[PDB]
Amino acid sequence: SRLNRESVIDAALELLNETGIDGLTTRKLAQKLGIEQPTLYWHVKNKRALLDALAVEILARHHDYSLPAAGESWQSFLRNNAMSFRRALLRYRDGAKVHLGTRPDEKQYDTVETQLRFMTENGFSLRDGLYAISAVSHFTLGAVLEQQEHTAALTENLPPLLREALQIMDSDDGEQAFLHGLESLIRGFEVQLTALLQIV
Amino acid sequence: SRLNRESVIDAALELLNETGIDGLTTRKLAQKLGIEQPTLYWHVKNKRALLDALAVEILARHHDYSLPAAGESWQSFLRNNAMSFRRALLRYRDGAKVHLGTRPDEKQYDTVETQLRFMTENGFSLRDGLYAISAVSHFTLGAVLEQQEHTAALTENLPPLLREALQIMDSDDGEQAFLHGLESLIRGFEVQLTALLQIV
Numbered sequence: 341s342r343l344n345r346e347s348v349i350d351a352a353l354e355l356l357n358e359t360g361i362d363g364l365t366t367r368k369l370a371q372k373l374g375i376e377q378p379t380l381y382w383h384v385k386n387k388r389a390l391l392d393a394l395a396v397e398i399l400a401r402h403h404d405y406s407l408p409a410a411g412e413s414w415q416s417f418l419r420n421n422a423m424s425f426r427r428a429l430l431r432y433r434d435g436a437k438v439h440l441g442t443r444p445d446e447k448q449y450d451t452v453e454t455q456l457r458f459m460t461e462n463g464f465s466l467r468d469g470l471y472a473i474s475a476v477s478h479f480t481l482g483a484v485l486e487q488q489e490h491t492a493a494l495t496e497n498l499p500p501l502l503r504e505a506l507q508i509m510d511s512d513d514g515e516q517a518f519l520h521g522l523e524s525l526i527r528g529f530e531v532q533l534t535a536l537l538q539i540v
Numbered sequence: 541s542r543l544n545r546e547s548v549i550d551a552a553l554e555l556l557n558e559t560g561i562d563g564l565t566t567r568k569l570a571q572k573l574g575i576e577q578p579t580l581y582w583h584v585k586n587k588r589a590l591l592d593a594l595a596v597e598i599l600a601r602h603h604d605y606s607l608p609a610a611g612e613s614w615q616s617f618l619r620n621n622a623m624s625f626r627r628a629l630l631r632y633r634d635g636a637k638v639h640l641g642t643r644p645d646e647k648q649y650d651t652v653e654t655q656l657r658f659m660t661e662n663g664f665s666l667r668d669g670l671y672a673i674s675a676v677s678h679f680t681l682g683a684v685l686e687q688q689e690h691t692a693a694l695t696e697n698l699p700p701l702l703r704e705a706l707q708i709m710d711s712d713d714g715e716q717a718f719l720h721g722l723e724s725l726i727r728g729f730e731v732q733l734t735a736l737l738q739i740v
């Protein structure tokens with residue numbers, strides 16, 4: 341079929357979602373696309389190139405709260421941004437794994453630059469803003485990774501509090517724990533920011 | 541070589557550390573151990589059994605701050621516990637990936653039960669204690685996963701704050717951002733706990 345960038349990425353997203361990050365082979369991608377391996381190689385050099393491109397596309401498609409609103413607080417932006425990043429990661433099988441270790445792409449420069457400048461305009465040094473941003477990213481990735489891999493994994497002598505914790509854990513999709521943790525994180529940054537030079 | 545549980549796990553840990561989670565194949569494990577595949581199969585049924593066992597062993601070996609000390613605060617326990625969990629995950633290539641989606645093993649029951657009871661003895665409901673514990677686990681896993689996969693990945697037109705953030709990011713191993721985020725998390729749980737029924 342068609343082998344422009346957009347279509348090879350569509351195909352790889354479909355393949356990822358069907359087979360997960362282990363089935364995302366250049367050989368199985370070639371089968372999907374109805375082509376021989378040397379034909380695919382012209383367009384896609386290896387699995388790592390595909391993984392990087394998929395990371396970028398996942399957020400392009402489904403990460404919709406990338407930028408603060410007019411007059412939005414840094415707290416509200418971080419909350420909205422995290423919920424969005426989470427939704428985007430959960431859209432595809434192993435989407436969080438796909439993101440891991442990536443760095444901002446050139447196509448994301450203006451956006452992420454705006455995110456960093458915004459934090460500094462709200463009083464954070466660049467370093468402290470980055471630390472907040474990274475903590476939100478890492479917490480979200482962690483939570484999503486554990487939720488997704490646990491669903492994958494699925495394929496009495498318990499002590500009482502653990503038994504209860506497991507029901508709680510298995511009683512929703514993970515969103516309740518994620519949102520509680522998110523509020524904790526945001527408020528911890530707020531304490532630190534407002535402390536200035538005071539022992540806190 | 542020897543094929544008791546302890547030795548098959550040693551071997552798989554060595555293999556994981558050499559080849560990462562993709563090289564942890566039952567076929568490459570068999571080569572390592574100097575045996576045929578049907579011989580390995582008697583002892584190890586599949587990659588998933590191996591992954592679960594490795595998750596447990598990684599913490600048995602190198603996760604040394606599993607339980608609070610006499611009179612230790614819940615804040616200090618969480619800090620010490622997270623630093624320990626982090627050290628343990630970083631000990632082996634893809635160790636965080638190996639942990640993802642696992643649930644407590646029977647061998648960990650008494651320990652994790654103690655962790656949960658401890659939080660409740662410090663004022664958290666089981667649910668709120670679990671939410672704190674999960675947030676710490678998820679944040680640590682996220683941070684480690686991003687650090688490790690980025691090292692794996694490694695194989696000018698930047699906007700200024702991003703350029704700076706990237707140097708900051710690449711200026712240490714990840715520990716500074718992790719520890720800053722950790723303090724934020726812990727203090728956010730503390731605000732929430734102490735709030736009781738007050739709007740916070």
Ligand SMILES: CN(C)[C@@H]1C(O)=C(C(N)=O)C(=O)[C@@]2(O)C(O)=C3C(=O)c4c(O)cccc4[C@@](C)(O)[C@H]3C[C@@H]12
Pocket residue numbers: 399403405406421422425442443444448451452455456473474476477705706709
């Ligand atoms: C917090 N939230 C999930 C962020 C986000 O909304 C992003 C996006 N493109 O809209 C990211 O790129 C974002 O998700 C993301 O992936 C970020 C990063 O990886 C980095 C890295 O790796 C190194 C330096 C700076 C950044 C960053 C500022 O761009 C990070 C911003 C993250």
Ligand SMILES: CN(C)[C@@H]1C(O)=C(C(N)=O)C(=O)[C@@]2(O)C(O)=C3C(=O)c4c(O)cccc4[C@@](C)(O)[C@H]3C[C@@H]12
Pocket residue numbers: 505506509599603605606621622625642643644648651652655656673674676677
């Ligand atoms: C926070 N810290 C890193 C914890 C820890 O030190 C552990 C350990 N064995 O010492 C875990 O097992 C610990 O790391 C860990 O992996 C935990 C969990 O997976 C769960 C799951 O998955 C579901 C219910 C309850 C737990 C839990 C209470 O045992 C979690 C405790 C985590």
Ligand SMILES: [Cl-]
Pocket residue numbers: 341342343344
């Ligand atoms: Cl074409």
Ligand SMILES: [Cl-]
Pocket residue numbers: 411412413416
């Ligand atoms: Cl607002």
Ligand SMILES: [Cl-]
Pocket residue numbers: 530533
């Ligand atoms: Cl503020």
Ligand SMILES: [Cl-]
Pocket residue numbers: 541542543544
């Ligand atoms: Cl033997």
Ligand SMILES: [Cl-]
Pocket residue numbers: 611612613616
């Ligand atoms: Cl203490």
Ligand SMILES: [Cl-]
Pocket residue numbers: 730733
């Ligand atoms: Cl307290």
Ligand SMILES: [Co+2]
Pocket residue numbers: 439442443444477
């Ligand atoms: Co990223």
Ligand SMILES: [Co+2]
Pocket residue numbers: 639642643644677
């Ligand atoms: Co766990």
